[PDB]
Ligand binder design. Structure first.
Ligand code: QXH
Ligand code: QXH
Ligand code: CL
Ligand code: CL
Ligand code: NA
Ligand code: NA
Lengths: 807, 807
């Protein structure tokens, strides 16, 4: 077996090769249709049953905007119907990321650039046949308005954030009122570190929560003829949180001081504000919710009788679903005389209600699944929730909880015990089960059909390489019925009326498609669900000829799990020759790289590496996503210690199976946790790995945030050895004494993994007498430079003939 | 002619080679004896005429401290007397950079670490024969005290800076009093940006002025029996000066707002403070000193009748020597009623006195030469000054100026004209002349013998490669007499009594020596000066065998100047072979690299390069030091444009003269302006230069300070093209498209040439699609890493066989 050497291109020739083969900019295709919504026409004489609204990007150099399409009552089943995209909005006098809608009025609300706009379609006023003009919500606010939301109780009112405070605005009367006076934009960021209605850094970055306020969905009527609207909101104080060059709670240090507040808004009979009463909790947040760090999720019950909240402790091993009555809130009064009367006036029976609680030795994984049924009995609440805590796989559970009067009484003048607010669980039926998970993140949710008493959900039952749509009953659970076709992975939106679903689907060979599917039952059994192809929304471009996709492989690991991987064979594969191998890696939690999805957009350059004569390998090691909580928990307290074993094991599996892998010329490369592991690979296994290109590596776990690090590694005092061994900066001495094996890539203004990680690693590498190569990216045309430098670095120090002579 | 290839050592082998050959740490030898002072014994029966005091480092791992040595009345001229070093101070209960002394009391004052200390020797109390105990000046000041100075009028009092304010302290009574209340350490650096008695950044960095206050050398007696002491001081406001991550006035932006203040200190008959009156100028600084940016130098006349100051304009093309009477200062009064009486009470004849003024089209070069003779007539002042403005070479001039009453009268209530304070010049004799300069920087000054009416000075008369001591009359100037021996460069201290001088001397082959020389006249002519070797103070270690020094060469440049250089021939020079060449460069103003001095300490690694088989070249291009103002002015408004022409010219001179220079493998390398020029070399002349290693390069002249940039390049608006063409960051497109030719080295916390220069160059290189290599030094063991990486980089991309195959 002779070694294959890649063609030694010049820097200009590589720049040319990259530019000629490039087809997407910023690793981004035009946004496929998303954020679907079905509205019924209700026109017996007309040809259409529904109108669907959705956000999409019409072309490559185009802005994301609202379109609609017509769903016909019948179809020509010999033909294939391609639904035409009708633009909902007219061109402006600036792209839309999301939108709101109020079923009963037709009112859309959305932000596009600086403006907040609205239109009407599909309410009482009917359905347009031409693009509507977006109506600007006018303002006297100087700065950009963020996070607009329609009030579901009254579609004339909206709320939004401006300079970290909550405002409301009427789109008909033009009235505009500030609700919170927590932040003062004249005062500096060190003194005034408070905010209302806004999720702080860790909650956005690590818990995927981007909003901090929620409208009450119903309006309390007043005797006068007017009403009371309500906004539940989070209020954060970040004074004690560490500063960096904004507020970044690094692991071990303080998180924000948080609480719930409520804004009570009296409107008169003609939509004019009478008064605004800002209301705080009756007792402090620390007393009523013992041991809670993070407000993970929040909202209201369907009838708006209670506010709900999913709450976590600092260790992220205890979740609590807690109902909060509006009566727990009293007006803010710095006068202690009036305040004391308000505390005593609120009943003792009015108390927080912990309707659910769960624990784990691994960690809680927050998701977006939580459905509350209409309240039939006064002293019971019925909901569906998902959890990994019973069986180690995320499954749906229907839970009924009893709303007891609490044993703790506030009149006694003491503090409540740890479990005085715990509601008894009457019932707890398992809706799904097995060695597979329900998906509750990244758009995956559930659609509950309350009529037929079913629940649609996404899951990994057929395969961990494919997401599929399933349906099952929630009263008499049993037969789980797959609705999506095997051989693709699916991301699905189900109509609110539960008679259609859309699926965005792909596999390794075929690009993304979006298609509409009609749902129906057989006449003999309404429980049984079948689907029929109705129409195409987005048609695939087809298997483009210049991308050769990889093969999914697997191997039985000595760890006792099947580990999956991807293999890009070199193009023009020569007989009796061995090729240099690049291992692309991420390897951290909450990500799966290996599945039956199209990888020719984001990872197109793994194919480009294969075209030059590199074997490219990717392996989902233990800790990675979609394999259950036990598989994920493998590296608890042990980050860095187990990942490379699985990579090396999978690499040796391929070497014995394929003679064309040259194990003497193996490189490794990743970004973020991938960069971290690329450093760990060269440190621990320099026998295996010739070169490591670490992009934006975590080098020091004490420099990363609370929400992420503490979930997987705990508090630093309780894991002194894990933090030391897991931090590559502390082990600089263990890097190679050869140069041309280590390359560090990092941006200067990266606010996720700070440059500090790279610079402190550089600091200790220099003190340890070790060589490194470095590229920096200070503050479009630089993804070009990165790709260029990477090909050149691999060529010069791994792939080419010159590289072998260099050692 | 076959190419020689350097031995390809591994990274570990290079680290070993560097460690084995290393003999100094941080490019620093132990400090040779400096800051000399001669005190007469005045003991007719005893064997010694003088005691000399001086600062020195006794060994390598040792602190800089005060020693003394005994100068005998006679010597054994057959033998060579090596003076023993006697320690002046005892070990403490922490090194000394400088000291003060009060002739008439014996009082030394010095800072060592945090403490300010004092001892006595050589006054009325006599001469110790054993180490004295340093006496701590006690304090209630919390923070470190800076810049201590004895009051020459009263050796009981000192002054010092504490938290940017001037304090005084009595070393006998222990009284301690704050004089200025300008800075408040509780208030932050953005709000309170004021300071007193302290030179701001640009004055320290670019004008070598480190102090901002000066004691009046005489004490005004009061009727009571007490007296008045005076401190002239600079007061700076840096509010409008730009901030960076301290106050850095970048070119084009505002410098500090400056003025003169005076502290008047009434002491009673027993050394106790009665009162302290803080006094400001009668009219603003901007009115009295029209067009002055920088207070370059300041002090007092010998009798203390006037304060003096050397003042510059923003362009640094107009110097003014200005006398300032204490009567120009009035007490500070925010009450306008009392203030108005004080303004009218001061006479109109009391006015600033511009005793000298000069201009140039090139630039003024500040120096430390300024001697004022005792005032014989009431309306005349007599002084020696040095200047390049008459002839383009720095020469000494004796000037007599007439102290006129000013035509401008303050009672009129108008502002003064541009030239109303100009004093008529009665006389202006040239003391020296020719195509050579007097030296007035870096310790070089003049010693004026007022008895014999001579002046000792350092100069370049015998050679621009050697500094020498000369003497000449200042009444009847003529025969300039060299006192130092040819074949060495000399740095000299002359005794205050003008009967001895010490010289620290070296040449290319022999390390530094320090020797004492006795001065005397022939009996027939007191004007004629001769010298005799008296004793050795520091003996040279001798030509150490592992350093081969370079040869000084020269060549007649087409520019019309003789340009000098240094050549390190490769060791073990083989016949009929050509060697790779490294050009070491600085090339900026105010530096000369090429002279007859020992280069085996600071530039020892140029020899180490020669030992591996590199030709090392150094060339003093136009703009560099010690060749006159015309030679220096060559690159005015044109930095970057002319330097590399001279380097390439000198390189081609050597190539035609020596066949062993391989012009196909020429590298360039420098730090600071050298790094800047290394970038300019690869940009302009990639035909000549294969590789460029730029250390801490200036890449953008608008990012550098006012004092330096504007002196050589003017204000950016008046030189738009020079700034653009001189800034390498703006011309990233002109760098090579080949990799392995450009290497950038920069510290992260460099506060002279900021990292910003490198990062913005990196920014534009990435946008231009250009390759670079980078090493960073974030925040002893790293000069090791730099040297290691440089040898390896030259080896891999210039010197070795692998480097030639790589292209
Ligand atoms: C990790 O999670 C983070 C996101 C938080 C970093 C902490 C991450 O994913 N980073 C990441 C970085 C890059 C590199 N780009 C960063 C931005 N930079 C902009 C810029 C602007 C101005 C200047 Br002067 C310089 C730079 C451009 C560079 C890229 C990616 C995306 N992945 C890269 C790897 N890729 C596979 C692959 C493999 C081989 C080759 Br050749 C090409 C691609 C998958 C996507 C993420
Ligand atoms: C230019 O004027 C400046 C001073 C203001 C820079 C703007 C300059 O002279 N710089 C300069 C830098 C170095 C390099 N050292 C910088 C400090 N650094 C400390 C450090 C601490 C912690 C860490 Br983690 C990293 C780094 C160490 C590196 C050196 C010098 C001195 N000259 C170097 C060149 N030398 C000749 C020479 C030639 C070849 C070889 Br091999 C070795 C030496 C002359 C002295 C100045
Ligand atoms: Cl079941
Ligand atoms: Cl003369
Ligand atoms: Na996120
Ligand atoms: Na200086």
């Amino acid at each position: 077996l002779e070694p294959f050497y890649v063609e030694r291109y010049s820097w200009s020739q590589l720049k040319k090769l990259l530019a000629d083969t490039r087809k997407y900019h910023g690793y981004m295709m035009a946004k496929a249709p998303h954020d679907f919504m079905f509205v019924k026409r209700n026109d017996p004489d007309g040809p259409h049953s529904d109108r669907i609204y959705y956000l999409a990007m019409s072309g490559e150099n185009r802005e994301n905007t609202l379109f609609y399409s017509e769903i016909p009552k019948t179809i020509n089943r010999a033909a294939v119907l391609m639904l035409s995209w009708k633009p909902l909005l007219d061109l402006f006098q600036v792209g839309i990321a999301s939108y709101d809608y109020h079923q009963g009025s037709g009112t859309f609300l959305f932000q596009a650039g600086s403006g907040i706009y609205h239109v009407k379609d599909g309410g009482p006023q009917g359905f347009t046949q031409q693009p509507l003009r977006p109506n600007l919500v006018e303002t006297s606010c100087p700065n950009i308005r963020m996070d607009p939301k329609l009030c579901p109780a009254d579609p004339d009112w909206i709320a939004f954030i401006h300079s970290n405070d909550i405002w409301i605005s009427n789109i008909v009367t033009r009235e505009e009122r500030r609700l919170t006076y927590v932040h003062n934009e004249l005062a500096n960021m060190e003194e005034d570190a408070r905010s209302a209605g806004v999720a702080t850094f860790v909650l956005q970055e690590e818990f995927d929560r981007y909003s901090g306020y929620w409208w009450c969905p119903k309006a309390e009527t007043t005797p006068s003829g007017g009403k009371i609207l309500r906004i539940l909101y989070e209020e954060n104080d970040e004074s004690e949180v560490e500063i960096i060059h904004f507020r970044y709670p690094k692991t071990g240090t303080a998180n924000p001081k948080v609480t719930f507040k409520m804004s009570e808004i009296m409107i008169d009979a003609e939509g004019r504000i009478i008064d605004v009463i800002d209301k705080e909790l009756i007792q402090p947040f620390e007393i009523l919710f013992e041991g809670v760090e993070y407000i993970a999720r929040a909202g209201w019950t369907p009838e708006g009788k209670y506010a709900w909240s999913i709450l976590l402790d600092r260790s992220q091993t205890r979740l609590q679903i807690v109902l909060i009555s509006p009566e727990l809130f009293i007006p803010v009064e710095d006068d202690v005389m009036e305040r004391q009367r308000l505390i005593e006036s609120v009943p003792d029976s009015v108390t927080p209600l912990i309707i659910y609680e769960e624990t784990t030795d691994i960690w809680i994984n927050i998701h977006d699944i939580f459905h509350v049924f209409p309240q039939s009995h006064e002293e019971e609440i019925e909901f569906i929730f998902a959890s990994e805590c019973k069986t180690g796989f995320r499954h749906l559970y229907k839970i009924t909880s009893i709303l007891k009067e609490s044993k703790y009484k506030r009149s006694s003048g003491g503090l409540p015990a740890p479990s005085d607010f715990k509601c008894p669980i009457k019932e707890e039926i398992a809706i799904t089960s097995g060695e597979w998970e329900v998906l509750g993140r990244h758009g995956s949710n559930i659609q509950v059909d309350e009529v037929r008493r079913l629940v649609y959900f996404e899951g990994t039952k057929d395969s961990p390489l494919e997401h599929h749509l399933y349906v099952v009953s929630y009263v008499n659970p049993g037969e789980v019925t797959r609705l999506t076709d095997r051989g693709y992975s699916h991301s699905c939106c189900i109509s609110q009326h539960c008679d259609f679903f859309i699926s965005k689907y792909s596999n390794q060979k075929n690009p993304h498609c979006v298609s509409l599917y009609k749902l129906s039952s057989p006449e003999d059994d309404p429980t049984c669900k079948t689907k029929e192809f109705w129409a195409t929304i987005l048609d695939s471009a087809g298997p483009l000829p210049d991308y050769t996709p990889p093969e999914i492989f697997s191997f039985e690991s000595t760890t006792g799990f099947t580990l999956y991987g991807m293999l890009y064979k070199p193009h023009d594969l020569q007989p009796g020759k061995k090729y240099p191998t690049v291992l692309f890696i991420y390897g951290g939690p909450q990500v799966q790289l290996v599945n039956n999805r199209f990888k020719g957009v984001k990872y197109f350059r793994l194919n480009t590496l294969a075209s030059l004569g590199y074997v490219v390998v990717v392996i989902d090691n233990r800790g990675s996503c979609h394999r259950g909580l036990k598989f994920e928990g493998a590296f608890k307290y042990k980050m860095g210690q187990i990942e490379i074993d699985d990579q090396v094991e999978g690499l040796q599996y391929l070497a014995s199976r394929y003679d064309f892998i040259d194990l003497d010329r193996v490189g490794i490369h990743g970004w973020s946790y991938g960069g971290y592991l690329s450093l760990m690979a060269l440190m621990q296994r320099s026998d295996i790995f010739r070169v490591a290109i670490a992009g934006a590596p975590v080098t020091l776990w004490i420099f990363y945030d609370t929400g992420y690090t503490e979930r997987y590694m705990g508090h630093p005092d309780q894991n002194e050895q894990g933090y030391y061994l897991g931090s590559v900066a502390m082990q600089a001495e263990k890097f190679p004494s050869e140069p041309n094996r280590l390359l560090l890539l990092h941006g200067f203004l990266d606010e996720n993994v700070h440059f500090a990680h790279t610079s402190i690693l550089l600091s200790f590498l220099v003190r340890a007498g070790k060589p490194y190569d470095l590229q920096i990216y200070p503050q479009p045309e630089s993804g070009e430079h990165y790709e260029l430098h990477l090909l050149h670095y691999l060529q010069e120090n791994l792939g080419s003939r010159i590289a072998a002579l260099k050692v």
